Amino acid sequence: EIKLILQQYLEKFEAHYERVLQDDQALETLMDDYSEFILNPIYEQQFNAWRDVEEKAQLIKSLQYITAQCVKQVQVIRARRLLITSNDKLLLVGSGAYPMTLIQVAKETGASVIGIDIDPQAVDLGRRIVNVLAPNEDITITDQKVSELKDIKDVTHIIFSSTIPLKYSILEELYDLTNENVVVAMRFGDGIKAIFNYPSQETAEDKWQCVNKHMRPQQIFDIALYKK
Ligand SMILES: C[S@@+](CC[C@H](N)C(=O)[O-])C[C@H]1O[C@@H](n2cnc3c(N)ncnc32)[C@H](O)[C@@H]1O
Ligand SMILES: [Ca+2]
Numbered sequence: 083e084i085k086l087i088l089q090q091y092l093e094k095f096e097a098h099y100e101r102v103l104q105d106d107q108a109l110e111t112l113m114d115d116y117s118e119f120i121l122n123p124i125y126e127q128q129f130n131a132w133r134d135v136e137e138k139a140q141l142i143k144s145l146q147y148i149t150a151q152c153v154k155q156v157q158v159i160r161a162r163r164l165l166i167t168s169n170d171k172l173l174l175v176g177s178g179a180y181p182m183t184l185i186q187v188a189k190e191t192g193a194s195v196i197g198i199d200i201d202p203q204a205v206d207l208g209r210r211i212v213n214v215l216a217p218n219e220d221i222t223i224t225d226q227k228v229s230e231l232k233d234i235k236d237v238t239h240i241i242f243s244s245t246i247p248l249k250y251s252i253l254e255e256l257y258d259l260t261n262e263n264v265v266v267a268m269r270f271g272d273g274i275k276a277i278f279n280y281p282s283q284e285t286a287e288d289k290w291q292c293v294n295k296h297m298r299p300q301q302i303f304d305i306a307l308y309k310k
Contacts, residue, residue, distance in 0.1 A: 084125060087119065094112055095149055106162075117278070120275055130273065141277075142276055146245075146276070150247075153245060154179070158204070164180075165207070172191075172194070172237075173196045174198075175243060175246065176243025179201070184197055188216055195221045196222050199223070228255055235261050236261075238261075238263070238265070239264070257289045257310070266308040267305055270303065271302070278302060292307070
């Protein structure tokens with residue numbers, strides 16, 4: 083029964099994705115409904131109760147991919163359609179093409195801000211969005227990896243986009259690169275929330291310690307803070 087609904091969503095997301103690329107003018111309504119489904123206790127129970135390892139795992143992986151691209155493409159359109167304290171320095175891994183949140187933090191806090199994104203399109207647009215929304219804020223947007231960033235030791239706060247598949251592989255890499263007092267915020271979704279997020283992982287106990295795990299029954303992602 084739960085299998086069916088997920089198959090319907092997977093088909094719809096691919097259709098809405100295939101479709102929105104052809105014409106920017108639906109998908110955003112589907113995602114809102116998708117959340118209501120993920121956050122439903124009824125379907126949280128059925129999701130856990132269903133233990134067909136093979137067909138379940140495959141369905142999560144597929145929805146994880148298409149929803150990640152859908153969200154990624156929403157920000158691309160929104161961009162072209164439009165077009166922590168002061169001494170701290172925030173690093174948002176997965177800044178996106180429409181970095182509105184990144185802007186919000188820059189204004190309220192006044193901190194330095196580095197955004198990285200592997201998509202050259204997201205970086206290219208993001209920069210343009212920042213130059214209109216906050217040109218007089220210390221906001222650097224680049225396609226550099228964490229290892230490439232020169233002033234990586236100055237970074238105090240790190241946030242990860244939930245929809246980054248190998249976010250924990252990056253977190254692993256950051257230990258040696260970053261200073262001793264750095265704090266990391268890892269967005270994730272476990273259980274039924276893993277169909278619109280990538281899940282948490284166990285960290286090397288000698289490296290990263292999880293000092294907080296903020297679960298929210300009414301929100302689409304949960305948060306896990308990490309220290310050294
Ligand atoms: C949907 S967007 C913006 C963040 C979104 N508001 C969220 O909270 O998930 C996520 C971005 O992460 C980027 N991304 C994916 N894998 C990445 C990686 N390994 N390093 C950096 N950015 C990555 C994608 O290009 C995508 O534009
Ligand atoms: Ca400070």
